[PDB]
Structures are given as structure tokens and as C-alpha cells.
Ligand binder design. Structure first.
Ligand SMILES: N#Cc1ccc2c(Oc3ccccc3OCCn3ccc(=O)[nH]c3=O)cccc2c1
Lengths: 544, 408
């Protein structure tokens, strides 16, 4: 009785036409038996040779089911509105007095197929002997392996549910694939009463559900979770094997555990998986990564459970700086009962700031909260309000953080150095510069100072930008606690101005370490080759 | 009513844009708004054979309790409106900028009476999202002219001209321009007379069936931010170095700038804090450049076939500077906004809407902004402070303008 969804093929393409591969006669009789039963129930109907289209059929106790390869038909079938890939996260669920799983049987076969599209779903039963022409059929309902069957089933289920949902606004119905998860806070008696009403309502539309064979409430082993009536957790995770693929599956299991297990670290192991591409290839076990596996095994020994969600209470997210470039966070409402946990790693890039990384993690957690709970959390962050205010006011970019409160949990996020906004009086003025020959990959760096100091160092395997940064480093090393540096390198000025906390460049890190020891540093920029006095002198010294 | 046939540009498929996650309050508002719209026939629910989708958001729009639906038709417009810009385009009045006062009215409710071509409605598909993927999203398509779609004002243009003809005849001195969903009404009258005329126009539309919701721009006061060199009694080496850098920069915008005599001051390896007397030749060189910078820039013309580009820089203390250009150093306009004192994002959002409004009034076109903010930050919170019925195109610059601001 369900209304059909009009379906069309892609404009350029046309219906499939494939040849059926031969098969064993025992399978052929089995396919014959299966197709005769389906024909009786209206699911499939025999066709003549007027139809030109065919797609290959196959057969696979404990078994002998029918499989059809619709890949060609799928390639020719229009795109649909895709079903939702994201699965409900258990931490987003609200505790309910009772909750029931009503899985739908033969779900696709209950829903009709567009009459004009049925022709393309045509299949030919293999003939037992090559001499006879095989029997031919066409689907009248949604084929199992077809592109539009998942989406058309979902829309049909939504239509069937909409009236009953309005009649019973108290009941909460969740749709995921063929399963319908129903929760409520009625008394146990009225819950079963409405569950039975829902079962009857689906039956009028030809959808069948378990009755008193419903899955048991404690062992909700759903999509890798345990859904207890009072809590949720990750299903038990196992894990020594050193193949590349074995490492990848280990890292996946650790990430999946990190939803609720705090402190799971994967940074060292992720460095092991660096485009090797050889799943069989064994990897050397760095002691840094090998210890990392040991730490996780200690954590995984502790059984961890998460709580469900309470709309009346506030969402709190708290973030801890773990290591370098790694951040860990917990989201909770009650003081020690966590809704879930997670990690955020430094996004790819060099010259990063701990303050900048913290903001991005706040950004990531904020978006995650909206997906799961529909509101944004209150944050507990390991940064002083004085540090953040200094950073935002002087930062070149527009930044914002929601309401937050300092937590004195070290390590604390701090600005390791701050540059001077005005030239320092009584401080030596270093005019630095660098240059290198691109073909030779060789160059030089140095400085010329107001007091007459000068220096040039020879360099090898360097680029022009590296020399420009190197000259700044040379001045920093050969300077007192207060120094004024004048450069023409926009590249150099930009890195230093961004106040990077660290980087992958050992030179930049050295510059950072020199900058932190300095009491005051002022960096000024001047146009190159414009006749500025100090810059002109150093340019001849470095490049010649 | 008959429906104008509408076609996407050839070799184009309808928009397939991901719905950004929403808050529970915004989802609840959107379901309430769309429930009523479906009853009135403006929209209706759609099946899974419609693969297209366009984002939907909810803005307060300065209404204390009223929630407004905003559809982000930027992708559909790019695939539709350019064809509609030529065939059914709308002219732009060069005098709206000259007018003393311009008021902006929302005429979006007008479009809902005119129907849309049945072969085009599928491209107007949007999805009301769901929390934690607990339910499939509610899916609708428009049966009438959508509010954010640039084809809607083009189709209604005939009906708008008929409705406004009586008022325009009685008030020939008032300029009326229609950018998508909005009516820009410009007068040179006193504000109280202008305000009374505006209410008269609102009543006129209401009598003819166009409901108007229940700001005041002053384009004559608008002036560009001119380049201004510092004026000092004593100059440090740092001062002269910065002056050389700023003058060197302005050479790209202003031909005629000289830094020869001023650079000669900087001969030698002197300390930054050292005061330098200015040679009379350099004093002349600095004075000459000031006059060159004092003169308004000349020789930049708006090319309608090109995009406009808006760059924004975060100055301190709530100030923002911006430049609108089509060519890298040929600026059609530059300005500076000061905040009343507010989140940086709220300030940036306000800046973007102010610039777009000015760009609409001046050129009848919206610029593509280069926003100095992280993408995820902007995507999460731009809707919070957004009051406009349109959405400009934007991109994100994560590279700091390490080059000194030199925009004040
Ligand atoms: N298998 C399976 C299965 C079963 C129920 C699901 C589900 O069940 C629910 C359906 C509607 C509303 C709340 C739901 O769960 C809230 C959390 N919860 C969950 C289970 C339980 O006993 N008690 C409990 O308070 C919500 C989401 C996914 C579910 C998956």
C-alpha cells in the first residue's frame, strides 16, 4: 500500500545488459526455489524476452541465499539523497525508563519499486542445461543491492511513522537502517502497550517486528558500544604484531577507545605509519612508541563507562595539554561522571603556538557538542585570563572563545616570549641579512651593528630564506639581553611576529630559545635595496 | 499565475551543499517556520529522488522573539543567476550613492505570491537537520519564488514596477533600487519627512498586498580613508625607516612618490633610537609626497564584468580597516569602521554587512570578502550576529598581513 518513489536512470546512460555466468545445477534449483516463493508474495514477477535488460544472479544450510550484482545498474541509476552516514553517539542519548529495539524483517522487500524502473532490475535464472533458455524475472520491490533501496526505505518508514509520532509525542522513535529504537518514560505497562500499538501500526503497512523476542535491555551491543540502561561504554578492545596493517588497526582501536577512555595516546605510533604503503612490511618498534603501547594497556585495564545526557544540566568541557601537539578533553555534567572524552592533535603545519592550538581545540569541541547535544559547552581551560586577553588583543586575526574558567592544572598554556612594540634605547642595533646562490645551494649570513660589530658566517645546503632566518639567530646569539634587530626579510618577520611556541625547523626552535632568554627584543623591517644605511652595508657583506 | 521558465546554465547540475550543524533552538525555530510555510503551500516535502540540497540557517534579524529563516542560495545563484543576470537583469541607479538618506526595506514576502517553474523547484531543496543523527532530516522544496534566490527579484521585477509606479509618480525625487529581497529607498528630504515618506511607501505596498516587516544610511557622509604620513617634530632612525617603508608601499598605489632624499637621511649604520635632523631636500621630499597622498586617487573605474574584492584588517581598540578593489592596487574604495566600544567575530560580522551594504548601494554588486579569521570559527558563529537577508561570498586568509597595516 506504500506509495512508490519515482526513480530514473542517469540521463546519458541506459539500462544494464549483462550475461549470466554459468553455475552449478544444485544452486540453480535453489535459486529456482527461492524465486518461486518470492513470486508468490508479489516481490518478483516473471518476464518475457520483450525486456532487453539483465543483471547477474548468484547463490551463496548455514545460506543458499540469492545475491544479485547490481553494480552496473547502480552505475546507471540516478543519485539519491544519501542516508545519514553519522550514527547517533551514545553520549547524546537521554536516559529513558524503557527502550526497545524493533528490527524490521525483509525491510526492503516490503516497499514497492517504481513500475517504470522495474524493467531494469531484470534477472535471468541460470539454465541447468545450456540448451534451455533460463527463466526471467523482474523486481517489484526494492532489490537488496540496489543504490536507492536504503534511501527509499528510509523515506517510506518516515512517512509511515509520522502519524503515530504525532499521536504519541511522549514516545521517542529513532531510525537507524532497518532498526527502530523506541524509548519512553511511561510506566512499564504503558510502554509495552504503546510498543504493541506501534507494532500493529507498522503491520498495516506490511512491516514486521519482533514481539516478546525483542533484544534484551542490558546487552545492547550496538555499533561497537554497550548500551546499558544506566550507562554506555565501548565494547571490549583487544591489544604483539609488528606488520604495518596490524599497527593501523591498533591505532584505530585506540582512537575508538578514546571516546571514553581518557589518556589514550597515538602520536608516536602515527609517526610509524608514514606512507610506507606496505601492509606486510614490519616496522621497527621505537621505544618511545613501544612505551606508548604499554601506557594504553594500563589504561585499557580500567573498565570505563560513560553517562547519558541530561538536558536540565550544563555541558562542561575541560581540556588538558598532553605532551607537545597533543590535547585531551573530557565532557561532563556531574563532577566525575563523564559524558565522553576525546583527543585533538595539532593540525598539520609549522610554527604553532600553544595558545593558538588551544583555541582550535575549543573550536573542535564546540562543533562536536552541537552535533551531539545541540548546544555548546562551558569550557574549563588551563590558561590564565590574563594570557588569553593579551593574545587576543594583539592577535592579527579575529578570535573568540565561549565562556570559560581557568583551571590550575599544569601544564599551563603560556606565552613564552613577547616582542617589544618600540625600539629599545641603549640597545645595540643589529642590521642582519643573508643570501645564497640557488644553484650552489650555498650562502652566507651576518650582521653589522651601530657600535661597529660585524660578522659573516659561511653556510652550505641553505636557501635564501634560511639564511635570512640564520642572520637573525646570529645577532641573537652575539647580543646582550636587550637588542634591536633590523631585517629586510618579510619571511623572517612573519615567523617571528606569529610568536611560534615551537616548530619542526631546528633553526626556528633555536631562535625561539634565544628569544626566551632575551629580556627585550625589538624587530624592525626595512625595504630591501632601497639605500637604507645599515641594510645596504650588510647586503654587500652577505652577498658578493 | 503563469511561471517563467527557469534553466540552470548549460553543463551545470543543481547544488549539493552540506547542511552545517545547528543548535537545538535554531532547529526548533526552523521546524516551526517551515511547518507554517508548508500549510500555506509555499514549500512541500520531498522524496529521496531529489539529490540536491542548499544550507538553511536561522537568524534573529534584530527581532526580539521572531526567528527568520535564511537560505544560503550562493551555490544555486552561481549556477542560475548569471544566466538570469543577462536575460532578466535589473539596472542600477548611479544616483543612489548621491542621495542624502537611503532606507532599506525587506520586500521578501512579496516573492511568495509568484509561483516557480515546476522543473526548477527540485533545485531549491533544503534540509532541516537533526541532533545526534537521531532522525532523518526534514526535506522541503520551494513551490514559490525563494527569498534568497537571485532569480526571484528578476521575475518579480515586472510586478514591482507596477506596484511602485503610483508612488514614484507622486514622488519623482525618490530613488528606489531593488537588490535581492531588499528595497533601497533614497531621498534628499529631512529625516522626519523621509521617515514619513517611507511609512507611506510601506502602506502603499501593504494596500497592494506586499507586507513589510515592522537601516537609515547616509551615503553623502561617506568618505575614503586617505593615506596619512606622520607629522613629527623630531624623527628617530626608526621613524624615518617606517616612513620609508610606508612611502615605499604607497608607490604601488600612487605614482610620483619619492624616497630618495629621505633615504639619504638613513645613510650609515645608525642606532634606531638616534634622532636625525631632516635635510631640507628630504623635508621637501616628505612635503611633496604628502600632497600627492592628499590628492584623491584617480583613474580607477568599476568594471561590471569583474568581481569586487574586499579585504579587512583588524586594527586595535575595536577598529577595522577595509579596501574594496577589482585589481591588486586599484582600490575603488577604502574605509575604516570603529566599534561602539563586543566579540571580535561580532565586530567582523558587522563589518562584513556594512561593507556589503555600501557595495550594494554604490555598485549594485556584492564583493567577495577575504576574512582574517579561522574558517571553523567563522562557520560556527557567523549566524549569531548576522542580520542581513543576503550572504556574501567569502574566503579565509590565515597568512597575517605581516606588512605593516599603514591603513591607520
Ligand atoms: N541495539 C540497540 C539500541 C537500542 C536502543 C537505542 C536507543 O534507545 C533510545 C531510543 C529512544 C530514546 C532514547 C534511547 O536511549 C536512551 C539511552 N538508553 C539506551 C538504552 C537503554 O536501555 N536505556 C537508555 O536509557 C538510542 C540509540 C541507539 C539504540 C540502539
Amino acid at each position: 500500500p506504500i506509495e512508490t518513489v519515482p526513480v530514473k536512470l542517469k540521463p546519458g546512460m541506459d539500462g544494464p545488459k549483462v550475461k549470466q555466468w554459468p553455475l552449478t545445477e544444485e544452486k540453480i534449483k535453489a535459486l529456482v526455489e527461492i524465486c518461486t516463493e518470492m513470486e508468490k508474495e508479489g516481490k518478483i514477477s516473471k518476464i518475457g524476452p520483450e525486456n532487453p535488460y539483465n543483471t547477474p544472479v548468484f547463490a551463496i544450510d548455514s545460506k543458499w541465499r540469492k545475491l544479485v550484482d547490481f553494480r552496473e545498474l547502480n552505475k546507471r541509476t540516478q543519485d539519491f539523497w544519501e542516508v545519514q552516514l553519522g550514527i547517533p553517539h551514545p553520549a547524546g542519548l537521554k536516559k529513558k525508563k524503557s527502550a526497545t529495539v524493533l528490527d524490521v524483517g525483509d525491510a526492503y522487500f516490503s516497499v514497492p519499486l517504481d513500475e517504470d524502473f522495474r524493467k531494469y532490475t531484470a534477472f535471468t535464472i541460470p539454465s541447468i542445461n545450456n540448451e534451455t533458455p533460463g527463466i526471467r524475472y523482474q523486481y517489484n520491490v526494492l532489490p537488496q543491492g540496489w543504490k536507492g533501496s536504503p534511501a527509499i526505505f528510509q523515506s517510506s518508514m518516515t512517512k509511515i511513522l509520522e502519524p503515530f509520532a504525532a499521536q504519541n509525542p511522549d514516545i521517542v522513535i529513532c531510525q537507524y537502517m532497518d532498526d527502530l529504537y523506541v524509548g519512553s518514560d511511561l510506566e512499564i505497562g504503558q510502554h509495552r502497550t504503546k510498543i504493541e500499538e506501534l507494532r500493529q501500526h507498522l503491520l498495516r503497512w506490511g512491516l514486521t517486528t519482533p514481539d516478546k523476542k525483542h533484544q534484551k535491555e542490558p546487552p545492547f551491543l550496538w555499533m561497537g558500544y554497550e548500551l546499558h540502561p544506566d550507562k554506555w561504554t565501548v565494547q571490549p578492545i583487544v591489544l604483539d604484531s609488528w606488520t604495518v596493517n596490524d599497527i593501523q588497526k591498533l591505532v584505530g582501536k585506540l582512537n575508538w577507545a578514546s571516546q571514553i577512555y581518557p589518556g589514550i595516546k597515538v602520536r608516536q605510533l602515527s609517526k610509524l605509519l608514514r606512507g610506507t604503503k606496505a601492509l606486510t612490511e614490519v616496522i621497527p618498534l621505537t621505544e618511545e612508541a613501544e612505551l606508548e603501547l604499554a601506557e594504553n594497556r594500563e589504561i585499557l585495564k580500567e573498565p570505563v563507562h560513560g553517562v547519558y545526557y541530561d538536558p536540565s544540566k550544563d555541558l562542561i568541557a575541560e581540556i588538558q595539554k598532553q605532551g607537545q601537539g597533543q590535547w585531551t578533553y573530557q565532557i561532563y555534567q556531574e563532577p566525575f561522571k563523564n559524558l565522553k572524552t576525546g583527543k585533538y592533535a595539532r593540525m598539520r603545519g609549522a610554527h604553532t603556538n600553544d595558545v593558538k592550538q588551544l583555541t582550535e581545540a575549543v573550536q573542535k569541541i564546540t562543533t562536536e557538542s552541537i552535533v551531539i547535544w545541540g548546544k555548546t559547552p562551558k569550557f574549563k581551560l588551563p590558561i590564565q585570563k590574563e594570557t588569553w586577553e593579551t593574545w587576543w588583543t594583539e592577535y592579527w586575526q579575529a578570535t573568540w572563545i565561549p565562556e570559560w574558567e581557568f583551571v590550575n592544572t599544569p601544564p599551563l598554556v603560556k606565552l613564552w616570549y613577547q616582542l617589544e612594540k618600540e625600539p629599545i634605547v641603549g640597545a645595540e642595533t643589529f642590521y642582519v641579512d643573508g643570501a645564497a646562490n640557488r644553484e650552489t645551494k650555498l650562502g652566507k649570513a651576518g650582521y653589522v651593528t651601530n657600535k661597529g660589530r660585524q660578522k659573516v658566517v659561511p653556510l652550505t645546503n641553505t636557501t635564501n630564506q634560511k639564511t635570512e632566518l640564520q642572520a637573525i639567530y646570529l645577532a641573537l646569539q652575539d647580543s646582550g639581553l636587550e637588542v634591536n634587530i633590523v631585517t629586510d626579510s618579510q619571511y623572517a618577520l612573519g615567523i617571528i611576529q606569529a610568536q611560534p611556541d615551537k616548530s619542526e625547523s631546528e633553526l626556528v626552535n633555536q631562535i625561539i630559545e634565544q628569544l626566551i632568554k632575551k629580556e627585550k627584543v625589538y624587530l624592525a623591517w626595512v625595504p630591501a635595496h632601497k639605500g637604507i644605511g645599515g641594510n645596504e652595508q650588510v647586503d654587500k657583506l652577505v652577498s658578493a | 499565475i503563469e511561471t517563467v521558465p527557469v534553466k540552470l546554465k548549460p553543463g551545470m547540475d543543481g547544488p549539493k551543499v552540506k547542511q552545517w550543524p545547528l543548535t537545538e533552538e535554531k532547529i526548533k525555530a526552523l521546524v516551526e517556520i517551515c511547518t507554517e510555510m508548508e500549510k500555506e503551500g509555499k514549500i512541500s516535502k520531498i522524496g529521496p529522488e531529489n539529490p540536491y540540497n542548499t544550507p538553511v540557517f536561522a537568524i534573529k534579524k534584530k527581532d526580539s522573539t521572531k526567528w527568520r529563516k535564511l537560505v544560503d542560495f550562493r551555490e544555486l545563484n552561481k549556477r542560475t543567476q548569471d544566466f538570469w543576470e543577462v536575460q532578466l537583469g535589473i539596472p542600477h541607479p548611479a544616483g543612489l550613492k548621491k542621495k542624502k538618506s537611503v532606507t532599506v526595506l525587506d520586500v521578501g514576502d512579496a516573492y511568495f505570491s509568484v509561483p516557480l517553474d515546476e522543473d526548477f523547484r527540485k533545485y531549491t531543496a533544503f534540509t532541516i537537520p537533526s541532533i545526534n543523527n537521531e532522525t532523518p532530516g526534514i526535506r522541503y522544496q520551494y513551490n514559490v519564488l525563494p527569498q534568497g534566490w537571485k532569480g526571484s527579484p528578476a521575475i518579480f521585477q515586472s510586478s514591482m514596477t507596477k506596484i511602485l509606479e503610483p508612488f514614484k509618480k507622486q514622488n519623482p525625487d525618490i530613488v528606489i533600487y531593488q537588490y535581492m529581497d531588499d528595497l533601497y529607498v533614497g531621498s534628499d528630504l529631512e529625516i522626519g519627512q523621509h521617515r514619513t515618506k517611507i511609512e507611506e511607501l510601506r502602506q502603499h505596498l501593504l494596500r497592494w498586498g506586499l507586507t513589510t516587516p515592522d537601516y537609515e544610511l547616509h551615503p553623502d557622509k561617506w568618505t575614503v580613508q586617505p593615506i596619512v604620513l606622520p607629522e613629527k617634530d623630531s624623527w628617530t632612525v626608526n621613524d624615518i625607516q617606517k616612513l620609508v617603508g610606508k612611502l615605499n608601499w604607497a608607490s604601488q598605489i600612487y605614482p610620483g612618490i619619492k624616497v630618495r632624499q629621505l633615504s639619504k637621511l638613513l645613510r650609515g649604520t645608525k642606532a634606531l633610537t638616534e634622532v636625525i635632523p631632516l635635510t631640507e631636500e628630504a623635508e621637501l621630499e616628505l612635503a611633496e609626497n604628502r600632497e600627492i597622498l592628499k590628492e584623491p586617487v584617480h583613474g580607477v573605474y568599476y568594471d561590471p564584468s569583474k568581481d569586487l574584492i574586499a579585504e579587512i584588517q583588524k586594527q586595535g581598540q575595536g577598529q577595522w580597516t577595509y579596501q574594496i578593489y577589482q585589481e591588486p592596487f586599484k582600490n575603488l574604495k577604502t574605509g575604516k569602521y570603529a566599534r561602539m566600544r563586543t566579540n571580535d567575530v561580532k565586530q567582523l560580522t558587522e563589518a562584513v554587512q556594512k561593507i556589503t551594504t555600501e557595495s550594494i548601494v554604490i555598485w549594485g554588486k556584492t564583493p567577495k570578502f577575504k576574512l582574517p579569521i579561522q574558517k571553523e570559527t567563522w562557520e560556527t558563529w557567523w549566524t549569531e550576529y548576522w542580520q542581513a537577508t543576503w550572504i556574501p561570498e567569502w574566503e579565509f586568509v590565515n597568512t597575517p598581513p605581516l606588512v605593516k597595516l599603514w591603513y591607520q
